[PDB]
Structure formats: C-alpha cells, structure tokens
Amino acid sequence: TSVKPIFSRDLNEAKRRVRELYRAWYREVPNTVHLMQLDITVKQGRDKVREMFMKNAHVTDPRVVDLLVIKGKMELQETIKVWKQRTHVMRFFHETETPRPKDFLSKFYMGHDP
Amino acid sequence: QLITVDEKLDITTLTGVPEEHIKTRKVRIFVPARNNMQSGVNNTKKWKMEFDTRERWENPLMGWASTADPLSNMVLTFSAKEDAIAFAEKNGWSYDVEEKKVPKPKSKSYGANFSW
Amino acid sequence: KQDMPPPGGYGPIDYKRNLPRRGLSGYSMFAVGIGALIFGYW
Amino acid sequence: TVRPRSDVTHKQLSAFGEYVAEILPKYVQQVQVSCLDELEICIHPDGVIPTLTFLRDHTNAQFKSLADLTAVDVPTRQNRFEIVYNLLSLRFNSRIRVKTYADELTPIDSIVSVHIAANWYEREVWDMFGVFFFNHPDLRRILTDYGFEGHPFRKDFPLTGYVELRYDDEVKRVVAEPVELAQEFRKFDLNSPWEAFP
Amino acid sequence: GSDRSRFLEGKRAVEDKNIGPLVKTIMTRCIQCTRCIRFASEIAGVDDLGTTGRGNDMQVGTYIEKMFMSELSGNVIDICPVGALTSKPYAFTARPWETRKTESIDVMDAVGSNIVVSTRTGEVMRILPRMHEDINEEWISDKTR
Amino acid sequence: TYKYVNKVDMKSATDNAARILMWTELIRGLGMTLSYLFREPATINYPFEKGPLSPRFRGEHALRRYPSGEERCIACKLCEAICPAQAITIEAEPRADGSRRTTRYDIDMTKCIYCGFCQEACPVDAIVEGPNFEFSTETHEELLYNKEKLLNNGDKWEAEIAANIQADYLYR
Amino acid sequence: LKKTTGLVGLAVCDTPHERLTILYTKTLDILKHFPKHAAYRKYTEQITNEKLDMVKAEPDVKKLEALLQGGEVEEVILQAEKELSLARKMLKWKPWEPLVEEPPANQWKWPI
Amino acid sequence: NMTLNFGPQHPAAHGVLRLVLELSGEMVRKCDPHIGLLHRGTEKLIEYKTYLQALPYFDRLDYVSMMCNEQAYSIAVEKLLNIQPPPRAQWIRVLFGEITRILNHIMAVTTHALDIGAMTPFFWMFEEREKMFEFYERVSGARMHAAYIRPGGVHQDLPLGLLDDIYEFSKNFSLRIDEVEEMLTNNRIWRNRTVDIGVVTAEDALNYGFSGVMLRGSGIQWDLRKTQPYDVYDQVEFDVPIGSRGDCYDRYLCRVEEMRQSLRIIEQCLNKMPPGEIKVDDAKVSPPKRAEMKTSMESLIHHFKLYTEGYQVPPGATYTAIEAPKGEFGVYLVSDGSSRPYRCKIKAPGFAHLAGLDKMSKGHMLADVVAIIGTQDIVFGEIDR
Amino acid sequence: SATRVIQKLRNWASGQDLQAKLQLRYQEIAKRTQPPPKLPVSNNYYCTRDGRREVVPPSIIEKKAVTPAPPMKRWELSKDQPYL
Amino acid sequence: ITHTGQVYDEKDYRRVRFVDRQKEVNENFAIDLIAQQPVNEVEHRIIACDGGGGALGHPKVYINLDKETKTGTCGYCGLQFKQ
Amino acid sequence: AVIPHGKGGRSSVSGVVATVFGATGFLGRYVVNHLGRMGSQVIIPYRCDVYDIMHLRLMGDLGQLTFLEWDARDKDSIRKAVQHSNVVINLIGREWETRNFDFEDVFVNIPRAIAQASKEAGVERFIHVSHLNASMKSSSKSLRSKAVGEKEVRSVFPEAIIIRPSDIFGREDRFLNHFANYRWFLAVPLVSLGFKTVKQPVYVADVSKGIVNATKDPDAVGKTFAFTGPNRYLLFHLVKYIFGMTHRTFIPYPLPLFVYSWIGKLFGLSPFEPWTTKDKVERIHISDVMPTDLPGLEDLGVQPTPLELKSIEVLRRHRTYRWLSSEIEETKPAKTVNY
C-alpha cells in the first residue's frame, strides 16, 4: 500500500545511498585503526563493515533502508570524529564475550534456555 | 511521493534488539485472566503481549533471584487482538494468540432456590 | 501544639542592600599622594 | 480537596481553540480544552510547521517559547509516537499544547526553523524514541552512549537494556557484556481489579 | 467506601476452629456473606458448613468440629473474598503483588482443568484456578492445588 | 512588580580616576577578607564534636524488637512494595510456633536511598532507619545487610532509636 | 524620546507612528489575495484594522502603547512585521483548505 | 580548528560535561557540548514506579534545588487528582521553596566565582548553606532529596522549633549576601570577567526557550510566580529582579536580588503561616495518620492500599510549570487510570540554556566559556535526566 | 566573644556592624527536646468530597477575533526600591 | 545456626566466606524470648492488644480469650493471654 | 552446586571453587579473570599487601573472589585456603632466589606442601605449572629444580594435571620485555648472536584458557601437557621482531654465555629485583625445546595465538612518541623456524 518516502522512493534509488555509505566507511576504517590506536588490522575491520552492511542485506522496504543509512551515517560522524573512544569502537568485536554455541547438542549441554 | 511497498513493516533492524532476543523468543498475546482470589473484572479487559519465561536462578552470595533475560519484565498492553499481532509482526517476534474467554451469560434468580 | 509564628509577628528582617558608600574623595586622595611624593623628592 | 479553579479560563481558551481551528482548518484534527483548564490542538503531522508558525507569529496568539517537545509512545495505536509540543505566550499569559502522531518509519518535520529551542529536544526524541525529524540541522544522539543500539524510552525496550559494562583486565578496556542482573527486578502486579466509578 | 471511621466502640472476636489441614479459618475475619455455606452445599455436595446463632455472633463454622473433608475443598479459599479462611500451606510465604502469574494446564487429573501458577523469584508459590467455561469453570481439585 | 538592577563634572571625573588609578576599590575587598581571619572558624572538631542532627535523621536501617523480645516484623511485604530502589526481599514462613515471622529479610544498602518510606509504611514500627551515618565499609559484601545485621543492629541502637521515635511520634 | 526599550535587542524606533502605518498597511494588502472567506483574512484584517485605527487616532507614543496593549511600541512593530511574514507564508500553505487526512482510527483515545 | 575536548572531569562547570571546542588560536570557534554523561534514565524508571515512589526521582533531578523540583510533581499529581493541599502545607511549600532558591543561588553565585577564581565567597556562603540544610534535616530527616513535598502536602508537620530558627537565619543572612556583595559586585576583576560577556538579546532568549533569570536578565518580564501563580504565592508580595544589558553581570546581579527578594517572601511566610494540618486528609490520596491506621480499620485498609498499590490518579495529562531556581521546571505527566504513571517528561531549565551556549559564547575565548556555563546555573542532573 | 580590638578590626575592615549579625550560633539556636505537640486533626460523605471523581473527561470543542486570554497587564516599578 | 537454620553444610563451598572472618548471627531468638513471658491473665471474654502502646505499638486487634483451652495469641506480638 | 546454574557470564556460576596461589603476579591475574568470568569462586591466597591485590577485586563478582593471607613458611594457611575448594592451581614461581627463598622452596618444597594439603583436603584437581624443557640435569638451577618438584607433586597427590608452558608472552611479560629492555643498555648482547637457539612463545591468555579448561575437563586427570605456542622462532629473529615492533635500533653483538652469566650475577645482586641473572640468562640462550608428544592447547581447546598478531599490545609502549602511532602492517615482518 501507499507510504510516504523517508528520503528515497525506490529500493534501487536508495541503494545508491547504501553504497555511498559503504564507500565512506571503507575509506574510514584505515583512519580509525590508526587514530584510535586500535589494534585490529585494516583488513580485519573492513571485514566487519561489510558484515554489517551485509547483515541488513535483506530488507526491501526502502523506508527502512532510508533509515538505516541515516543511523549508519551518524555512526560514521562519531567515528570519523573521535567522539567515540577506543572502547566504543572496539565493542563491535565481542572481544571478551564468548560466542554462544548453536548446535542443539551444544546448547542442550549447557543452559536450560533454548 | 506516496511510494508503494509490500512488507509487514519489519522494523526488526530499526528496533535494536539483539538477534537472539528477536529470534528465539515467543510473545503470547492474551487477555489476562481474573485473580480467582478477587471478583474484580477490571484486570481482564486489555490484551497483553508477554514474552517467554527463561532462567530465573540464585545469586550465590545472597540467595536473590538473578536472570539474563533482558526481555523478562516486559508486558506490553494493547487494546485489541489486531493491534497486538501487528506490533509483534512489526518487531519480528513469534506470537501465540489466545482468544478471549468472557464468562457466558448464566441466568440467576432469587426465587429458584425456594422451589421444592 | 504546632509550630506557629510568635503571636504578634516574628519581627522585621532586612533584605535590601547595605553596601555602605564611603571613602576619601578623589581630590583629597591624590593630594596626599603627591604630597607624600614631593616630600620624597625634597 | 477540590481544586480552586476559574471558569473564565476554560471559556476563554475554549474560544481560542475554535479560533485556531477556524484559522487553520486544513491541519487541525481535534481541539479540546481539558478540564485541567489547558488547551490541546491536535494537528495532522504535515501541519507541524504551519500550526506552530501561526502560533509563534500571530498578533492574537503569540506563543514565543517552546516549553518542551516529547513523544508519548502508545504501542497499540498504529502511529505509536505522539509528539507533543507545549508552547507559552508571554504576551497573553497562557499556554497551549499542539500534539501530532508519528509512526516508527514516517518522519515528521522539524520546527528548529520555528523555534531554535527544538534543536536539542528533537535530537532527544530521536535518541529516546526513534522519531526522525526532516531537515533538522545535526540530528544525533543527545543522551544515550556513543555506541548505544536501540531507542530506550520506547515501551518495547527492556528497562535495563541488553548491555552493561565492566573493566576486563585481559583486554584492559571497558567491555560490554550481555546483561546479567543479580536480582531481577521484581515486577509488582499492583493494580486493582475494582474500577473506580467515573 | 469511606475515608474515615466513626466506630469508636468495641470490636467482636470469634474463636478460631480447625476445618482441616488445608483451610486456615481465622474466622474473626468473616463478613457473614454465606458464599462458603452455599458452595459447600451447591458445588461440593458436602453440607457440613452452616450458620449458627443470630445477631452479631452468627459465626459460619461447623457446629461440631468435623473437618471439611472433600475434594473441591480448597475452592472455599478462593471464594471467600475476606481472608477469614485461607490456605494453610500457602499461609505466609508471599503476598500477591509480587507473584508473577503464568497461565498453564492441570496435569494431575485428565479433566485438564485450566490453572494459573503463581511464581515468585523462580519457585511456584501457589496454583489457583483460572476460568475455562467448558473444562473447570473457576474451580480446581484439592490435589492440583 | 519588576526592579531594574543595572539601570561629568571634574569632582566626579577625579573620583572615577581615584578609583581606577590609585585603586581604592579592590581595597574594600581586602579589608573585607581581613574581617574574617579574626573571626571564629565554624569548623567543628570532627571526630570529637560531631555535628548536630535531628531525631528525624535517616541512616542505617534496623529491625526493632518488642520489649518482650519478639521480633516486630510480621512479614507484610508492605515495605518492598514501596521501596523504590527495589532493595528488599523478605521471604517468610510460619515460624513453628504457629506465629508469623520472617525467615528472610534483606536490604542491599548499595541500592537504598534512605528515603524512609519503609519506616512510615511499617504498621508495627519494626523497620526503622537509624541515626547512624558512620558505617562505611572496605568491601561490597558488608553493605548487603541480612536480618541478623539489622536485628542485632536494632539490638544496639534501641536505647537511641526509641527516644527519637517517642520524640517524633506525634508529628507522625 | 524613550532612551531604551527595556528588552535588550529591540532598539528605540523614532517615527513609531510611521513605521507602523507602513507595516500595518502592507499587511492589510497581502491579506487581500487570500480567498474571500478565509478565517485568516477575516480575522487578521479585523486586528490590523483596529491597530491602524489607533496608530492614527493617537499621536503620543506612550499613549499609543496602552491602546495597542502591547509592550514598548518598538515591540508593537516587531509583531506587526511578523504577522506580515506569516500572512505571506499563510497564502502559500493555504491553511484554509479542507483537512488533509482524518486521524487514523483511535489515534486520540487516552485511556488505551 | 583545534578540537580540545573540555574535560568531562574538568573541575569547571558541574563535571559531567564534555564541550568539544574548536580552538581558532586563543578564541573558541564553535562549541558542541556532549551531555549524556549523567543520563540515568530517570523518565524510563518512573513509568515502572508508583506516584509516591517516584517523588524521589525528582529531588534528584536538580540536586541543588531539592524541594522545588518536588513541588512541581506534587502540583502536577494534585491537578490530575483535582485535590488541593491544605492551607498550612501550601505556605510550608512556599517557605521551603524560597529556602531552596537562596541555596540554589548561593550554589550558583559562589561556584561561578570559584570557576572564575574567587575562592572565599564559596566558603562564607556554604557555612550559611549548612545552616539551611539543617532546616531540611530538621523537617524531613535528610539534608538532601528530602522527599518532603509529597502529593497532597508535606509529609510531616514542621518540628516545634523550626520557624524560630528560620527567623534567626533569615534575620542575619542579609549581611552575608552583601559581604559577598562587597567582595564581587564592584571589583574591577569580576566586572571585567562578567560584564558584556554572553549578552543574549530579548527575542533570541524567548526563541531559544531560555525561560529563567536568562529570560529576565535580558529585560523580558516573566517570573511564573507572578504570572501564573502556584500555591499561595498569590498571597505573598515580592519584586521580580529584571535586568538590562543581558550580560553575565546583570544576570549575577539578578540572582543576588532574588536571594534578597526570597528573604522578603520567607519573612511573610513565617509572619503568616496558618494553623491547620499539613496534608489533604481524604485518605484515598494522602496516607492515614500513624495513630488512626493502628486503631480504625478504614485507615489500615487505606494505608495498606496506598503504600502497596497507589493513588490510582484519574486518566489525563498535564504540563505544570513552577519557577524552579534555575528557571521553568515542568513535568508533563501523562496518566492512565493506573497507580503508576505512563510518561513523565521533566522539562529541565538547562536543556534549553546549554543549547544557547554555542550562540551566547561566540567571539569569546576559552576563559569566557567557563563564565558562560556558570551564568546558566546548569546542573547536569536536570539536563541529562 | 572576641577581644574588642580584634572585633573592631573586623567591624572597621568589613565596614559593617558585626556583633549583631553572627554567622555562628551561640544562644540564637532553639534548644532541642521541644515539648511534645498535639497536632490538630456529620455529612462527611466521601461522595461529596471526591476530588478524584469530580474531574471530567476533556471537553472537545460577524464573529470577532479572540486572544487566548486578555493581554497580560504590564508590571510597574517597585515602590520600596525601584532601582538597585 | 540462625534462628532460621541457614547453617552451611561442612562441604558447602559457601563457607569460604567466613574464613579470616566470622558469621553475623543474633543470639536472641524471639522463639524463646516470647516464651519467657507471663501469659497475660484477663477477666473479659475479649481483650485488646495495642502492642503495649498507642501508635508506638502494633495495630490494635481484639483477641478472644474465650476458651481456656487456648490462650489467644495476638498475631502481632505472639503474646498468649490466659482468659 | 558443581551444577553450573546460570547463563555464562558474571553472576552465573560454573560451580568450581579454586585456590590459585600465585594470583598476585603475571599469570594468575589472567587465571582469576577467566575462572572469574567463568563465574567460579576463587580463594586467592595472598601474602602480598592489599594495595596490590585490588587489581584482582574487579575480576570477579560479588562474593566470587575471597581473599586470605598465606605465608609459605607456615601451613594451616595452605590448609584453610584449600579446605573448602575442589580445584587447586599452583602458579608459585620466582625467577630470582630471594634471600629467604631458594628455587628449592618456590618450585619444590612449596608446591609439594600445597599439593600435600590439596590431597588432604580432598580437592579433585591439582593443576601444577612446571616450565617446558625443564627436566633434571637441564643445566639450569631452576629448571632442574622445577622438575624435581614435578615429581614431588605427582608422588604426594597423584592424578594431578601438570602443564609445562613454553616461554610466555603477553603484556607485562618478562620474556619479550627482557629482550625489549636490552634497548636501554647498549644493544642486545645476544649470545650466539641469537641464532642457534629457538623458542616457542605462547600468549598468557592461551595458557590461562588452558588452565581453566583443564580444571573443568574430565580427561585431563593425571595428564601432563606442554603449551608450546604456534611458531618456533630463533632467538636472534625474535629480538629483531621485538625491535622494529619496539621501533628502536637493533644491534645483536655477540658474546659467550659465560660472560653474560658472570654479568647477570651482578644484576642479580640488585637487592630489589634482578634485572637479569645467571639463571635467566641460561633459560634464554641455552634453553631450547622441541615438543614431541604432549596434548597442548589445541587439545585442551585453545587455538594458540601467534606472536605475529598480539605484539602491538606489549611493545606499543616501548616506542618513542612519533612512532607510538605506528600501526601493525608496518611492523617489521617476522619469520618462523623449525630447527
């Protein structure tokens, strides 16, 4: 049914924005690692970026992709600037968190929660 | 303007809910039932959407009840089945709607107990 | 019974400023300086 | 134990409510003076800049200051968020409420042009509820953490969030961690089941 | 009701009796509403309960001390709006605002009566009926409570 | 009513230059601080002359005991249903006398806010909030009070609590 | 005359009677292009008229002020100039039209 | 330019601020204050707490003004219930509201000075503030976040000696003000640091929603205690201290005058406080007295229900603003029929003021910014909420 | 209590009378243990005194233009102290 | 062992807590102190029990010492009353 | 309560109480962090001053970590520490021989006593940490001693886990650092120029995760282990890798071990802490070990972390400003050896 567009009209039109963000992030990862004295490698980080831009790679409601960009850009602003410290950026890497197993037998074997 | 889209408006990616709390979690739309202990029917009129019950364990030091289910104390209150199914679908949770159970009309008469 | 203003009112408190204007005048002030400063030269 | 009230106000303001409804018929959906003697003009979201400009700059209704901009979230309503703008007229010593409705994915305009007070309040509404304000200079998180994910004051967000922080020696940084609370918050179902006679 | 009291006189007291090991009848609480007498006589067919005496010392308790032994017994608790007679096992373990209430099914018997399990901080504190017109219409067995 | 707050002959011009050149106006401040080294400091000798308080002072919690020796707490749960910091857990039982008492009581004193909503709700005057305020601790565990660090606590200050209750009961 | 209008920014305006007549008269015109029966034109022309009516009936500023019931005239102007801007802005937003869209159902029922 | 993030820990301001600055050489090109360093979630938590058990959220919003924050909520919850506090309680709230304005201003004027570098004014006044705390401790029980101005009244009557002791403090406090007065009002150093710094024009102040001494300092006439009176202020006489040349100094001078005008209001409240009870006594709203709940059943039931469940205020919504010492403090309380609120938007005089920092501190050096925050009397509890 | 010379030092240096307005409480203070108090407490049907139920759900509502309320009367300078 | 048990089993690792420390345990058990009290003899069928106080004690409840068979015990003080 | 009853994280419980004796130094602060994040109680016996045990107090949750004072000279301190535990871990070990304690004591006598009480108290596991390539007649006073003890441990408390780690790298290490420190004094005076001697280095966390997994792994009983690490590097290359990553000039001028032995002697003489000493010098140059057949981290469940990766974190400090900002890809690439 009809819906007002947030910023883009067709999913294709919007994707134009999604790519104009990917590029931005990609061209920024290198800078961050150095500026925030992060320890992860440029390649490693750039991987994360794709992962995320990829995680959201299934929605088709332009309005949603028009919205995730914005949220997305905002996250650059902060990261481009150093408004975010090392702690903030490094949180995208679950360094301490032990990744949860997924195998049923691997979960049944630990924790009553599914 | 007025673009047209055909989704169930899944804002699952705008909500910000960790995947595992948007994937393996079942909301249960239902109109709360009456507290048999009282006869007030004002707490059985609005549809609630409560989530599944996960681990409630014991803090080793003081014996308090501890938990890791962030969405445990969550009881959203709607006003109709239609508006609850919509919210759950909107947020990407699985639902288990339970139809309302209004008492049927039972005819009561004072004299009846005097017949023989 | 119950704390209540003393019968007849508490009394008057002053609130307005009282920073008190005072001091030597200028003509006089300077004339002691120069008078102390010519004596330093003689 | 019954408020000392003036009926003059109910009437005077009611009359202004009809005035505003007559002057702006295209955007105002419902005007009502509540019994608390306050006024509420409910406008279609498109009327956010027209309705507020008329009130900021009209001789018979000057509403110069924006007291606050907030968004109640009633999850049931289709358009959940109900942005509410409370405005004050220093000239006529009276106050007005203009409230409009916005959904998760439909942004409403920004009044920063009408009142520069809103530059910050609109950022807080985005951070807290996720409503987006069109052509708003510098919209970005005012209150939440730099990396916070999720809009907190939404009724569908867990009181205590999903992440907490701690210092991990092994990594020498303040690391996040899925929330484990040592005492869940006892949720009390305190709400009587005998309704009050209206 | 009323914000204040005008009863500046002396209250009455009745004598706690033993109606069983399931129902704690602190009947000085009783508002002589005769729900108990009826349930005991119209749902459970056990007409052991009854009113004795007239005036302000009408006490609704068994004239001779004979326990109210029947299934369907615990329902009296749920049906007395006053807390005169309440449950003896769940005497003082909790207080209702705290109890988180999860709606589930009776497995003790095959009628599959609907029931609400009231859990506090993770251990069940009481199971009380929830209404199902067709299966258990507001009542549950002494066993499954 | 409104009040304005901030709104040349040679006599005035010289006066202005006598207050700018031979500063005379920063001197009215130096004499102003000279007026205070000669006054009596307000400092109290702290450890020996503790400052003044009121019988209303809300501090370390304590469970009062009936003069007979019977705990006053009858496990109502009328004091965690109001405790806004959500600090109290008072799991109870029949105590095997047939009576009604706690097996559990708790405050996490690192969550409490000393608001006294627990001493004014208690219909029996069991939980109070004593006039202690020297109970700092080197550890986190010494603040999660149990029923026995509140009952012997109340077996300590009862000479000092009851005077303040009896002193303020009418106003409450 | 007046040394300073209290408010910091608003500066004393000589020729108050004149500045106003121009601003008020311009406005009385911009309203003209408004639809015949548009509340704005019907009401704002009712106000602007009364103020132009006094702006020319009384030549003492302090007096004038009391009549226009505003603050310092330097303010009555500030406002006269803004209504003009709203009047221009209103003629574009065409507020007089029929409601854009009725609220979705139950979008204004508080005890939900 | 140079992005020097003013210290979040920096001793200046209230220590909960960042204020990234662009340093164009010595002067500051732009300020982008990054508040959020103290957002505890006050408005989220209140939705999960009953109306009585949320009052405390309020004395902890602007911890310098304790009982005036509460007086807002208390006014808001009263209007939703259509009940009014008893006459004595209303005078007590005005008595305590003026003691809070003196203590907020002693906080604002003296801390501004230590930021500027004057250290002694803080010490002389803070001893005068400990005397005032003692008044809160001797009526509520706490020296802070008293939780005394509850819905329907104050929680307990004034102790038998409080009004005499408030007279003795108010009697001698005036000398303490001008003692600070002589120290800072005429000094070359203070006037240069404060005069013509952060001038805000009248229309800009209204547009930026300043609404406080910042509004009155620029000459706009608005107090909210004489424009939209609350409680019994309509029966007490005082003069709003408006000012011209909206500059830090004029704003300082206004804050010193309001301390003096508050002594005039405190003087009237002690002289004319009525005999009566301190809380409306329909037990449905304010809890029953300790003796009554222990002797009459209707009172035990009303005490049990009020403490355990709540007032259950009728469904509605209200925005009630009172003149808190900082400026207009308002609570937009949306209420379903339930005992616990649905939304409580705390309008903080301070969210608007800090927004003005970039406009007010333009063409100003690093040192001026320290004065600009000081003259907004911003405490980050209210801004962060 | 201070040597007169020392205190005249503080009165002259301050410029203000200082024995009168003490910042220290000697006998000015009310003594504690104030005598116990006795706080002050037909047709008192709650249905007549119902603040809670008295309120009603909000009212929803040639011609002359109407302002929200009559314009605010401008204040006037204080009689005791017009300028300070 | 506290008046309510709680004694840790020897094997319980929850005993380290008290190492180089000790256990806060109140020696004055109210189960016994109240038993060390004289049954309050009365003349009337029913008696009050304000908790030995008006507004400083417990809510006032009237107990029916009507059967010598049982000494009424106010649910608040645990005081037995001997008809 | 050996039944873990909670979602993994702080405030859960994995139900394994433990006495980790050397939890004041380098390896134990990571062990408590893992045992701790694993939410297991940890009775940490400390003979230190509390000011230095605080860094441990947050690596746990309310009540998880318990402290008590223990001095090796007296038992009953060993006894009460292990009295309520079921796991016991031994990390005691000192490079130098302080006047009061000999390699004898810190590596044999003491671990023996601890294990003595361990068996006496009924603890199931006595994870013990002896050095890799550390056997009798290994021509180094400590390593030899260390192995002597390994026996004493086995004898008294059989069915004990014995980990023998390779050189342990990681922040606050004294391996990479000792080499890095050479920058201060002249240049690296590597014996054999650093060639002819190869070392396998393992990250502290890799060892820590292994010890934690072992405490909870059933098959680990009575099992010795060698935590060698991913790559074998010749000493000259690793010092050169420490340099470049340290970003300071490198000079591997040679000299005989005997000289450096006599040399360190003096450094050992230092009263507070030897900067280096004969025993250390030996375990660096001559010490070289090829693991052959021992389970290892992979077996116990840890993927050994290469030194190529986590070397910033431990040498980013040793750089002068103007180089501190240097990234990793820039660091002088290293290379591995087999030998």
Ligand SMILES: CCCCCCCCCCCCCCCCCC(=O)OC[C@H](COP(=O)(O)OCCN)OC(=O)CCCCCCCCCCCCCCCCC
């Ligand atoms: C006719 C005879 C022949 C000719 C004779 C010579 C001609 C006449 C000479 C007259 C001299 C008059 C005094 C001139 C020296 C004093 C310093 C001065 O000139 O003032 C500068 C400054 C003024 O400040 P301001 O009001 O801002 O003026 C500038 C406005 N744009 O002042 C300041 O603001 C400085 C403030 C700094 C902080 C001061 C704090 C108080 C210091 C108290 C010191 C007390 C002890 C002093 C004596 C020490 C002795 C060793």
Ligand SMILES: NC(=O)C1=CN([C@@H]2O[C@H](COP(=O)(O)OP(=O)(O)OC[C@H]3O[C@@H](n4cnc5c(N)ncnc54)[C@H](OP(=O)(O)O)[C@@H]3O)[C@@H](O)[C@H]2O)C=CC1
């Ligand atoms: N790279 C490495 O470090 C390697 C280590 N190992 C082995 O692993 C173990 C742990 O190594 P690491 O932690 O670095 O060694 P440390 O030098 O850090 O000492 C370990 C702990 O033992 C304590 N300790 C030392 N001497 C005594 C004593 N006489 N009495 C009581 N306590 C004592 C220390 O605390 P305090 O400050 O109180 O003395 C310290 O916290 C060692 O025993 C070592 O043999 C094996 C291979 C490589």
Ligand code: SF4
């Ligand atoms: S039901 Fe409860 S109250 Fe009504 S009579 Fe039987 S017992 Fe007394």
Ligand code: SF4
């Ligand atoms: S303390 Fe007072 S209130 Fe809390 S439970 Fe015991 S008795 Fe009831």
Ligand code: SF4
């Ligand atoms: S004081 Fe307030 S917070 Fe502390 S316990 Fe009593 S009620 Fe809960």
Ligand SMILES: [Zn+2]
């Ligand atoms: Zn009793």
